[PDB]
Structure 1
Amino acid sequence: EMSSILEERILGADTSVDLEETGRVLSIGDGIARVHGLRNVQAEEMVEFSSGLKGMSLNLEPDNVGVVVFGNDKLIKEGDIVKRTGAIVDVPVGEELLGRVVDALGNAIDGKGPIGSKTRRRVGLKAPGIIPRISVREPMQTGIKAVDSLVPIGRGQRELIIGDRQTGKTSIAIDTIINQKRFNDGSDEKKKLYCIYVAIGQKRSTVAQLVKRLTDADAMKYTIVVSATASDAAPLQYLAPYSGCSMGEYFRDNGKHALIIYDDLSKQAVAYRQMSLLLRRPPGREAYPGDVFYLHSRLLERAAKMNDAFGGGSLTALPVIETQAGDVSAYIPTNVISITDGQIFLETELFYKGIRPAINVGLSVSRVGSAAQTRAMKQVAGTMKLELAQYREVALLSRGVRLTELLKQGQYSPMAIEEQVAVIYAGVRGYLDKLEPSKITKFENAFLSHVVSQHQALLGTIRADGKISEQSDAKLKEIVTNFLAGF
């Protein structure tokens, strides 16, 4: 149509010209531009090349400025003009990013038009100090039985998902994102969790698959997907986690609660190493720069729970780390493990032995723990944790196998906390030792069906009260006894 392209597309275009402060490309190569001039450029300031490309000035040196290019250096030649933008790198933030797939700088890559964003936020902001924070109390529900019961996560926590390749880390993150739909459509506003998935160094078709999976479950309406894939410049993959963290800090600072997944931080470390080695900064261990720990700690400190004076919002962080051959002792894995508030260790042996999700409950710890659980979940899960430990000590034994086969879960099926509590109750009270370990799984399905067909009252009770009462204890007791008699 000749109206959508000319009514204001040309009528309003900011045709004015300005007196620009510029420099001149001395050299260009491998995404690094050494630029003469640019006297008044700031450190980490965003500059613009004469071909529309943008870069960030990282090495302020006496005779040149080292600029990392946010794109392909094919379009930059020696002698090109580099204009200042006067601003430190920032990205659009707000509610208008929900449902959109954007790149590391906030440009929509989903072919749906521009993000109608009016607020912008720096990517390198400082984390909140001691005073604005308060203890982590509200639970972040993942929908995964093993996590929600034995490695609970609160709102404002940093829980690391660490494991080998193809162990099920992205599956945990996506289950957690899908789970928040029960709360994001409800009426309680302080229970809604807006999700953010940062894809760093991934295949682009993998991100397309993930967005398809999130749209199938209708989870995209409250999810921002930041995508800096394998073909994107190393600066963009370096900057994607900070852009996502700014998009989440917007919610954190407004009384809302957000969840961010960094999938994964090993590839961000690789991209940062590339940028640093090409900026001629001296290498350290495994050629990584000296400040890779600072790279990840200044990022993972921005996940926080705020007190009431600052809105009461939160930002939960689920960084992902891929280890080689199970070497948790590597450089970046140990860095991120020392940073975060706990880890969820996934194993290949546990994966192939049928334990899915392959969470290693022996190693998986949540430094927040029961402080961020519901009372009902705590009641059942303290006993379940004790019995699973005692089973691991001798692997009674039949109850232990029952609980193990009860921790298994399908993919893309995050259960509600009430149904989780009912299942763990049925498993921890003896109602599962009369059945062989093989059939346990199917019973659960049937059980859930029954409970979600004719017993919505007890589930609503558990949901509202948060704890089980002795009355409701007896109710669910008799329900599960009758169902086991009929099963």
Structure 2
Amino acid sequence: DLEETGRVLSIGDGIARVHGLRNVQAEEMVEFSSGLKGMSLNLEPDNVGVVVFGNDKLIKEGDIVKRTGAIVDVPVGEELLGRVVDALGNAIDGKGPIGSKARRRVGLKAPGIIPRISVREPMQTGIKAVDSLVPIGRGQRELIIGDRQTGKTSIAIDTIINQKRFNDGTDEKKKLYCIYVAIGQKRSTVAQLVKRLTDADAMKYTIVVSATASDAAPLQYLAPYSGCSMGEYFRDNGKHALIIYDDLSKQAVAYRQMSLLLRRPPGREAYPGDVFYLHSRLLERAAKMNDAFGGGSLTALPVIETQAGDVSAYIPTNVISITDGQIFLETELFYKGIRPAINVGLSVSRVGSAAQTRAMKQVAGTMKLELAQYREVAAFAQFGSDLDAATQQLLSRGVRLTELLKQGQYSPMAIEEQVAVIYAGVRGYLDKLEPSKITKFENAFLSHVISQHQALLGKIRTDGKISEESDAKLKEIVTNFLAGFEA
């Protein structure tokens, strides 16, 4: 009845000093009268400093605080693959609730060394630039960084679309289950987004954990942890997961704020310190696992949107140092229209080689380096004036290759297409052409192969990798095609 209940000792600021229920199991989400849950974070003796899920407007004091007697868990399952939920795994989709009714403590930890297994994986993005230059393997926490839906977000889509190929393929590792933790992203933003993902029907292998620009702060805050709990499920259940946290900048904000409101200070940048732990605890749980975990993965794509490219920015520094690289995107370039827009100098996978795909590596590995120089002379050299043809070419060629790393948004690829177009540049074929025509070339080039060199694609696909032979066929394609492509 009210058998064992407690009275809201005080309330103001969404911080419910709660009298009673005293023997609360720690970090129990409890329930107040108001429907509302809170989680009893703070056990002071005489009261519970209670972080309130939902908000204090509702609230009236002395109100019954019921144990919920439950420690924070979030629902876990897979029926959310095909769903949008709020952070508590309750829908918001309005389809009624998810079939996923299993729950799982978000209070979980990142596995040990032995559990884990290192990468050697590729992990395909369908974004050429990305898998090539910031080559991706599965399990990895890596920073997606870019400045104000500068297509930042777009990226995630192309990859997801790329995972389509896997989940729509049959992948036993590449079948990357996407968990989209949407942090702070306004309802419109999300609503909008979702609408697309569903359209991308990628939603089927996709969870969307949703903290829009409406949430109570812990909720926004919580959302990743929710996601965190879930993705490890796949990972550990062999299944290969992808989580997009977008973005922790907001989460942190909420969280600091949460502290602050809790009249708990912060440190640096007004941010508390173990927000480092926050991200660590959050992110370390994304990993590439040993076989005991079905080998699986939770590949973590945290997103931090640089604020003004600022990263020295303590929390960014933090995240950066956690991530095994960053993909910084050159937003002005984006704005130059360049989509992708990348700041590849500022895009790194320190890793590099464990994370790549041989098909691509065969042209791209080599290219990356070569580009290292092109780019290098794009920047290094910088006048009006010409150098030598080599470099001049490198610039021209490079520039061509630049188009190639673009990808009019929402258009990822399977590996051979990428490699294909790349072959064309690397192997000298389209140094020739111009950007205006690159883009065109590619279109044509694809329809050409699409029609024709499906064989070859077949091959490349087969080996997952190039063959000189395939190359020889390629060689022909490009040359000939190239000729067809203009004339």
Normalised to the residue count of structure 2, the TM-score between the two structures is 0.93
CA deviation map 1:212-250 (0-9, x unaligned): 111222211111111112221001001000001112111
Judging changes above 3 Å, is the alpha-carbon distance between structure 1 residues 392 and 187 closer, same or farther for their aligned structure 2 residues? closer
Q: Which residue does the alignment assign to 1:194? A: 177
Shift, 1:58, TM fit:
1.3
1:166, distance to aligned residue in structure 2 (A)? 3.3
Retained in 1: the 8 A contact 2:235–2:241? yes
Tell me the matched-pair count. 469
Secondary structure of the residue that 1:96 maps to in structure 2? coil
Deviation at 1:361, TM superposition (A): 1.3
1:178 is aligned, of 139, 153, 161, to 161
| Alpha-carbon distance in structure 2 between the residues aligned to 1:321 and 1:189 | 29
CA distance in 2, matches of 1:416, 1:290: 42
> Which digits, 9 at most, give the CA deviation of each residue in 1:79-106, with x for residues without a partner?
1011112221001111111111111111
How far apart are residue 19 of structure 1 and its match? 7.3
Q: Deviations over 1:302-322 (max 9, x none)?
A: 011111233111110011112
* TM-superposed deviation, 1:449: 1.1
Residue 486 (structure 1) shift? 1.4
The CA deviation string for residues 361-404 of structure 1, in whole angstroms up to 9 with x for no partner, is 1121113312122211111112211221111222x322222211
Match of 1:83 in 2: 66
Report whether the alignment pairs 1:292 with 2:262. Answer: no
Change in CA separation of 1:436 and 1:187 when aligned onto 2, cut-off 3 Å? closer
Structure 1 contact 59–279 (Cα < 8 Å) conserved: no
Query: For 1:35-90, what per-residue CA distance to the aligned partner results, in whole angstroms no more than 9, with x for missing partners?
Result: 11222113311100012110011111122111111112222211101111222100
Contact kept in structure 1, 2:244 and 2:303, CA below 8 Å: yes
Supply the distance in 2 between the matched residues of 1:481 and 1:198 (Cα, whole angstroms). Answer: 45
Name the stretch that deviates more: 88-97 or 276-285. 276-285
What do the CA deviations read for 1:281-307 (whole angstroms, capped 9, x no partner)?
122122212311111110010011111
Q: Which residue of 1 aligns with 2:236?
A: 253
Contact 2:141 2:299 in 1 (8 A): yes
Match of 1:444? 442
SS of the equivalent of 2:149 reads: coil
The counterpart of 2:144, out of the listed 143, 151, 161, is 161
Summarize deviations over 1:295-351 as a string: whole Å, max 9, x none: 111001001111123311111001111222222211211111011111000122222
Distance 2:293 2:436 in 1: 51
Comparing 463-472 with 407-416, greater Cα deviation is found at 463-472
Q: 1-side partners of 2:402 and 2:212: how far apart?
A: 37
Cα distance 1:309–1:326, how it changes in 2: closer, same or farther (>3 A)? closer
Change (3 A) 1:19 1:77: closer
3-state secondary structure, aligned to 2:79: helix
Change (3 A) 1:393 1:188: closer
1:334-373 mapped onto 2 (5 Å cutoff): 334-373=317-356
Q: Output the CA distance in 2 between the equivalents of 1:184 and 1:327.
A: 36
Superposed displacement of residue 174, structure 1: 1.3
Distance 1:42 1:278, change over 3 A: farther
Out of 411, 414, 426, the residue aligned to residue 412 of structure 2 is 414
Is the contact made by 2:398 and 2:431 (CA closer than 8 Å) also made in structure 1? no
Q: Give, in angstroms, the shift of residue 20 of structure 1.
A: 4.7
- Decide whether the 8 Å contact of 1:28 with 1:73 is kept in 2: yes
Partner of 1:469: 467
Distance 1:60 1:188 in 2: 47
Q: Are residues 281 and 213 of structure 1, via their aligned partners in 2, closer, same or farther at CA, if it must alter by over 3 Å?
A: same
The residue aligned with 2:46 is: 63
Aligned partners of 1:172 and 1:212: how far apart in 2? 16
Indicate the larger mover: 141-150 or 353-362: 353-362
Between the aligned partners of 2:296 and 2:3, the Cα distance in structure 1 is: 41
Inter-CA distance 188–405: structure 2 relative to 1 (3 Å threshold)? closer
Distance across 2 between alignment mates of 1:114 and 1:436: 52
The alpha-carbon distance between structure 1 residues 125 and 21, as it changes in their structure 2 partners (threshold 3 A), is farther
C-alpha contact 2:397 2:432 (8 A) present in aligned 1: no
Alpha-carbon distance, 1:359 to partner: 1.3
1:290–1:437: structure 2 CA closer, same or farther, 3 Å change rule? closer
CA distance in 1, matches of 2:333, 2:468: 37
Instruction: Quote the Cα distance in structure 2 between the aligned partners of 1:431 and 1:217.
Output: 34
Cα offset for 1:114? 2.0
Tell me if the contact between 1:388 and 1:404 (Cα under 8 Å) persists in the aligned partners: no
Measure, in 1, the Cα distance between the counterparts of 2:174 and 2:270.
Answer: 44
With the length of structure 1 as denominator, give the TM-score of the two structures. Answer: 0.93
In 1, Cα distance between equivalents of 2:469 and 2:214: 59
**In 1: Cα distance, 2:419 partner to 2:207 partner:** 30
Any gaps of 5 or more consecutive residues in structure 2?
378-393
- Answer whether contact 2:141 2:283 (CA < 8 A) is retained: yes
How far apart, in 1, do the equivalents of 2:329 and 2:335 lie? 11
Distance 1:185 1:327 in 2: 38
Contact 1:38 1:65 in 2 (8 A): no
Deviation string for 1:389-441 (max 9, x for gaps)? 111222x3222222112211111101111100111001111111222332111
Asked if 1 retains the 8 angstrom alpha-carbon contact of 2:329 and 2:344, the reply is no
2 CA distance for matches of 1:21 and 1:239? 28
Q: State how far apart, in whole Å, the 1-side matches of 2:58 and 2:171 are.
A: 51
Are the counterparts in 1 of residues 150 and 331 from structure 2 also a CA contact under 8 Å? yes
Task: Please report the RMSD computed on the Cα atoms of aligned residues, expressed in angstroms.
Answer: 1.5
415-424 or 223-232, larger mean C-alpha shift: 223-232
Q: Structure 1 vs Structure 2: percent identity of aligned residues? A: 99
Q: Which runs of 5+ in 1 are unaligned?
A: 1-17
Equivalents in 2 of 1:375, 1:255: separation in Å?
Answer: 24
Q: 1:183 deviation in Å?
A: 1.2
**Matched residues in 1 for 2:121 and 2:2: separation?**
52
